[PDB]
């Protein structure tokens, strides 16, 4: 098994069972001794998976409108950098069909449902197949593993029926997730330093490599 910056303490609990395990834990945050709160190794892996999935959504969602505007696919007024779409009102605001606080309330309610349900699956496995919820609860029974519930709603195409295929797909998911959250951190830092958007940063790097670097950007903007 390949190991990247593995430690003697880290190898005492990282035995390769979890997907994407390379022994990397210099700080020992997943140590199973004195474990409580949110520092549980299962909770840490679950949070890594959820953060990776959300960042795989976000790293494409924060760069797709800019690419579509450059390609002239759908109108350029909706083609803005990710900080110019009302996320940061000083950076830019777009006039949607609703006030940003009203949209925040709508999002908060919908995700409160869709995420407190997930939290109660984590607390009590299989508890969302019991109570009546619009008749959809039959698809919310889960599989005993909170990060990978499966079922006809979350796994409709039936991908990875085989165990080796499931393990390979889990490894692919965690690796692409880690890359995506690295990309999201890069988006944030490039917005803080340059402030022109990540796709514009890529275009400036492609047009000239020497004049547009991390080194020739410390002047900020």
């Amino acid at each position: 098994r390949p190991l990247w910056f593995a430690s003697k303490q880290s190898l005492s609990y990282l035995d390769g069972s979890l997907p994407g395990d390379f022994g990397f834990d210099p700080l020992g945050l997943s140590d199973p001794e004195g474990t409580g709160g949110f520092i549980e190794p299962r909770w840490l892996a679950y949070g890594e998976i959820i953060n990776g999935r959300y960042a795989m959504l976000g790293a494409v969602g924060a760069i797709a409108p800019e690419i579509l505007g450059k390609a002239g696919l759908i109108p350029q007024e909706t083609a803005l950098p990710w900080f110019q779409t009302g996320v940061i009102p000083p950076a830019g605001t777009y006039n949607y069909w609703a006030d940003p606080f009203t949209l925040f309330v709508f999002e908060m309610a919908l995700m409160g449902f869709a995420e407190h349900r997930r939290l109660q699956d984590w607390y009590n496995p299989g508890s969302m197949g019991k109570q009546y919820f619009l008749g959809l609860e039959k698809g919310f029974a889960g599989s005993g593993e909170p990060a990978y519930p499966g079922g006809p709603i979350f796994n409709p195409l039936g991908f990875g029926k085989d165990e080796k295929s499931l393990k390979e797909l889990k490894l692919k998911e965690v690796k692409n997730g880690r890359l995506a959250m690295l990309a999201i951190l890069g988006y944030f830092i490039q917005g803080l330093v340059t402030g022109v958007g990540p796709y514009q940063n890529l275009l400036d790097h492609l047009a000239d490599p020497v004049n547009n670097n991390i080194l020739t950007s410390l002047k900020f903007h």
């Binding site: 910056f5 593995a6 430690s7 003697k8």
Partner: protein, 66 residues
């Protein structure tokens, strides 16, 4: 760049890393790496940070002196 500051900082960092690697300069351990002397990432960061501190001080002193 290649200026005096670049040369001083590169020399200080390289000298501190060499002193921490080969020289005597460096119950709670566990980090492992591939180099044979056990010069882990923590030792690399420590030597680089100390060399950076020394080089920054030397540069800012020589700038005032001339």
């Amino acid at each position: 760049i290649g200026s005096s500051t670049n040369l001083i900082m590169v020399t200080s960092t390289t000298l501190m890393l060499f002193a921490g690697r080969f020289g005597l300069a460096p119950r709670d351990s566990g980090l492992q790496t591939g180099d044979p002397a056990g010069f882990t990432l923590a030792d690399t960061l420590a030597c680089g940070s100390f060399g950076h501190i020394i080089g920054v001080g030397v540069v800012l002193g020589l700038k005032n002196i001339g």
